Amino acid sequence: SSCFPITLKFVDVCYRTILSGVTGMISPGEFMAVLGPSGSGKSTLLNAVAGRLHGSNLTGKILINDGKITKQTLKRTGFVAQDDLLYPHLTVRETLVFVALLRLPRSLTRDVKLRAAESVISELGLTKCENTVVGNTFIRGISGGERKRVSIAHELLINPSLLVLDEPTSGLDATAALRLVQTLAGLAHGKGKTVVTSIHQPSSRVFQMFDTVLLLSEGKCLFVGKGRDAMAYFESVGFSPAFPMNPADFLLDLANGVCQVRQTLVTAYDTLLAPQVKTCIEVGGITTCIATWFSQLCILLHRLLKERRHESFDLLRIFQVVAASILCGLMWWHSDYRDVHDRLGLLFFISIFWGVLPSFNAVFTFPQERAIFTRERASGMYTLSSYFMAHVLGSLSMELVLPASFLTFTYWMVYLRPGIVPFLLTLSVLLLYVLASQGLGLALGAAIMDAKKASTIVTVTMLAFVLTGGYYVNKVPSGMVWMKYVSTTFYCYRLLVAIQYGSGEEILREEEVIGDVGMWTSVGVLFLMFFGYRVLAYLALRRIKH
Amino acid sequence: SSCFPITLKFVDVCYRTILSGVTGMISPGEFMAVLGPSGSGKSTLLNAVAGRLHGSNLTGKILINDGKITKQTLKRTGFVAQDDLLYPHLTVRETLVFVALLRLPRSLTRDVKLRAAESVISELGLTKCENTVVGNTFIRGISGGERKRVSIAHELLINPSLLVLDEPTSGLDATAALRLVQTLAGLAHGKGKTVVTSIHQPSSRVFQMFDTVLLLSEGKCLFVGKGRDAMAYFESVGFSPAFPMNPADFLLDLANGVCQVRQTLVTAYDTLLAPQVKTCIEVGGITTCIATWFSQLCILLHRLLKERRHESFDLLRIFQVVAASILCGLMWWHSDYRDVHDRLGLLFFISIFWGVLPSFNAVFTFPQERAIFTRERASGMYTLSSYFMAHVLGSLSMELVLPASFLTFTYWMVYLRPGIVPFLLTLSVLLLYVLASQGLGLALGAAIMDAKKASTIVTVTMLAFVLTGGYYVNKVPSGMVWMKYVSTTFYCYRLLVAIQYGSGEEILREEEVIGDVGMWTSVGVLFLMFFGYRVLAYLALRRIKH
């Protein structure tokens, strides 16, 4: 792999000071480690050499193969970050299949996009756990050193020629962190890539696997050399250990003061190594762009299918609906339609329960997956308008199966109106109201992007929708009668009474409670709240500038 | 300190195998490290040598100063565990003052119990942050290496002569984990104590601070010696490194296979070191016991005072009560008492809101602090009956200030009955109902001890209390009329109507809604649910056998 070499030179990097004159070169086929104490800015060097600091404070010359950070050579570079962002309910094989269908170019087949995702599984040693779910801290999945190899496989699908990693071995074991360094040395030696990593606290034989070492001590680097003459260099200045110790622990003490002194390391670097490195340092149309959109939406629906039915079918949401079905069928068992005060309280309990329950569970959707979206939209996998519509279409399928089972169990126990026409009109109003209540939660969760702070604002909003719905207060004090024309509970409840009683005179053989609004101007407003709360959630997610 | 030495011998420990013949002795004034791979059972050795495995599977001779694990010599032993259990809202000084008032003996003054808690602060180096709050991951407190010194200070108040620690330096920094080992070597050398610790992955100069080393490789130990002749012993068998490396990394490779082989280490141990260690291995009344109880309750009230007002006065619970006060004063503004259907809906909204809101927030109390309670009750600081009554008395003070401010703002806006006698009877019924609704949440949170699983059972229970309360369903189908005699919402709502309308005939100048239950048999049942739900929470916490 990678028969197209690369050479990375970063003459005089200065970031504002964090970095103050870092200079070195990275030949193709080298495995380099950036060593430094926690604060020297060894994470800032990796981002500003992979093209993540966009020339604002970065005053240096990051030139890639005697060039620049032009986008033609930036698609040959992968940056593996420090935290892992994976979906739990996908297995290891189908994690890397949906990523290969989104990242690899559109002018290929589906044949060599599945053989490009199984040549990456059986190269990082993931062929044992490929049918095991990924999981998280709450789902029994895969181990944390084998969870890191899925993040590295996510970057090797596009076949990069420069791989930049940010603390791979961190939290891993003693022997899991050695086999990971042994494959990263197998990429740089066997394939011919160029790996630049930053190891925090290496070990006695992890330091033997390295090839070149960079030592940062708050800005100015102290040593750039081939990783086994590091201990023979500092004894020429006059620094040497006493007791037998790790060669990586002797260097990380010279980086912060403790010797066996910090200022003479900086002066001796600019007189013997910096003259040595800097002499060598110069020598489709319209039909294409629509079918690309619908394929981004069909992959993102199947990728998120297992996540949506984890939200809407756990056993603590089924138990709240089975309980409310039994308590309604036992309180209003074989109810009579001639006592109007009881049946109007049945029809208002349905409006409270199915407006509070869809709106509350919808404010957790977008703040839960924000780091996953902003990492993957910035990497060119998908846009916002196809990510968003895969949540709109995928949530109006799973959220319409518990209210449809509530009503079937309950409709002929409590003796509502008999017939197939009053039953299918009562189900249609109930499912339109669940979709209008859900979009109010999606609009408040996206505008605020905090799940605990928006959970109390949907409480206060839905408390005012119930009180102005038309059941508790029979006469409203004349500066509050405007308030019922914005609530979803008012328009649902006037439609349920119009189906069960009609115009009103059929029971007259209690008139302000069977009053007049209109049956076509109540379904017309529940569609304006269906479409209108989904548009205000798109515009609230458009504001997040990456 | 510790002018009463101790000598720990643990001849032939075998635990069922985890441990299979561990044998050694620990002289007074030594700092010993137990080294081993993750799985060798170096945590099981520390618990079974501090007296935490109670002779069931532990088939060995744990003898302490040629004795046994009799309770007279077990109060001279401190075991610092691995995770830290601290209250966040207490500062560092008053954390160690409440612990000193509970652990030190009762036959002292309060003078030398505060000078015994400030000679521990200015000995572990906590005199800089003594006025800084402890915090957690969510509150900005103190650093995680300085959070560990508060756990060690918790065990040095009783002045032990054997201190046993379980991975102290874990998650700490490179230089924070060196200064912690330097004070633990200052206890064993300067004072004269006996420190036995188990370090996971030590460093190059952390290994120089040790004095004796124990090396466990799955059961049978491989080396017991004075920590600087460890590398000179294995080269006499014929094992030696090649590249320069940490002496703790060479040993932890011989413990699992990897050499520069595992079975010849076990045989060579039982022929040269085991004959060497085993030749030396033999040569008040009634007024006292009540005032002790009331002092445990006065300390535990002030210790938990800052935690109770974090629960009941955050800005997301104040915003739900200010919103409901405004929505009630605007919907029923200057209401009239002659339209009875509106005022009965005002009095039923108060019963729903103040039964759902106290019961929901009470199921989080006991599962939140279970590891703190079971650690500290087992250590002899307090019992269950004084820990429990400090939550009962401390929660009926802070939970009666938001419903008392709700009613004062609202009572003369919505024009309920004028006078000081109908106002103080309406406040008294509302505060008795809040205390009865709270105990139902405490009983369900303690029986289940899971905050998410009990949060849906208080939902289903309080949904059935509302529907059988007496407002929605006017006639109940004759097998469900028993169900209203167990709900708290029924007994509160019949008392509010009896204060605002009375016997009923005063408005008769709508009779099943101003019916008959009794005003003394409704306050008598709200007290039986006050006391009865608190007794069922004590019996549900009594079942947890440590």
Swiss-Prot record, chains A, B:
Matches recorded under Pfam families: ABC2_membrane (PF01061), ABC2_membrane_7 (PF19055), ABC_tran (PF00005)
Sites where a glycan is attached: 57
Residues annotated as transmembrane: 284-301, 313-333, 344-364, 396-416, 429-449, 454-474, 513-533
InterPro entries (UniProt xref): AAA+_ATPase, ABC2_TM, ABC_transporter-like_ATP-bd, ABCG_dom, ABCG_transporters, P-loop_NTPase
Gene3D superfamilies: P-loop containing nucleotide triphosphate hydrolases
Disulfide bonds: none
GO biological process, one term: transmembrane transport
Binding annotation for ATP: 36-43
Membrane topology, as annotated: Multi-pass membrane protein
Family: Belongs to the ABC transporter superfamily. ABCG family. Eye pigment precursor importer (TC 3.A.1.204) subfamily.
Cross-referenced PANTHER family: ABC TRANSPORTER G FAMILY MEMBER 25, ABC TRANSPORTER G FAMILY MEMBER 28
Protein name per its UniProtKB record: ABC transporter G family member 25
